[PDB]
Amino acid sequence: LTEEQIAEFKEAFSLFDKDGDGTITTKELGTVMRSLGQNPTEAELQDMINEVDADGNGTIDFPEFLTMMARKTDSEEEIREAFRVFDKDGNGYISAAELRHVMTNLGEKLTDEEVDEMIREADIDGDGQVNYEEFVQMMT
Amino acid sequence: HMGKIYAAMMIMEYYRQSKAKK
Ligand SMILES: [Ca+2]
Ligand SMILES: [Ca+2]
Ligand SMILES: [Ca+2]
Ligand SMILES: [Ca+2]
């Protein structure tokens, strides 16, 4: 696996592990879901955790979070939303500016250079922006 | 740094995808 999927699978964890004690709780998950505009019941959070909790200790460690990411096919409908969510002004293209905002909503306060490289990396046709298709590949 | 987007995506799916368990 890439040296690159390491830091990548890592940050993903860090989105939830807000204290960074090393394990993910209902509380943390919960706060994350509220950031995303959802409001899950106590039972749903437990229930979400239960499906991946290999060792039955009610929390989620790093490798169980790998069980999460690997397991979950209706991709397009969820992605067309993500695009919509990013494309704040919905002109059909996501700008560096609009990307900054999103990373931030997630908590990652980025170097601008990282944001441009992010754009530079998903930008297929080279116009400086990410359009729907480019987004589709950046994401899939 | 695509890490976090992937997660929001997943978990979102997860939440509905788990809540098809109620
Ligand atoms: Ca934690
Ligand atoms: Ca566990
Ligand atoms: Ca736009
Ligand atoms: Ca482009």
Nearest CB to B14: which of A48, A82, A103?
Answer: A48
Domains contained in chain A, number:
1
Please tell me which residue of chain B has the smallest CA distance to A36: B8
Rounded distance, CA B14 to CA B7, Å?
10
Length, in residues, of chain B: 22
Helical packing angle, A26-35 and A42-50, nearest 10°: 110
Structural domain boundaries, residue A43? 1-140
CATH code for the domain in which residue A85 is found = 1.10.238.10
Residues 1-22 of B with CB under 8 A from A: 1-15, 17-19, 21-22
**Residues of chain B neighbouring A51 (CB-CB closer than 8 A):** 18, 21
By 3-state DSSP, what share of chain B in percent is helix, strand and coil, each rounded to 5?
75, 0, 25
Q: After which residues is chain A broken (C to N over 2.5 A)?
A: 72
Q: How far from each other are the two terminal CA atoms of chain B, in whole angstroms?
A: 34
CA B10 to each of CA A13, A72, A74, A95, A121: distance values in angstroms, whole numbers, following the listed order:
12, 7, 12, 23, 21
The phi and psi torsions of A93 (rounded to 5 degrees) equal -130, 140
Q: Judging by beta carbons within 10 Å of its beta carbon (0-12, 13-18, 19+), is residue A114 exposed, middle or buried?
A: middle
The resolution in Å comes to 2.6
CA-closest candidate to residue A65, choices A52, A46, A51, A47:
A52
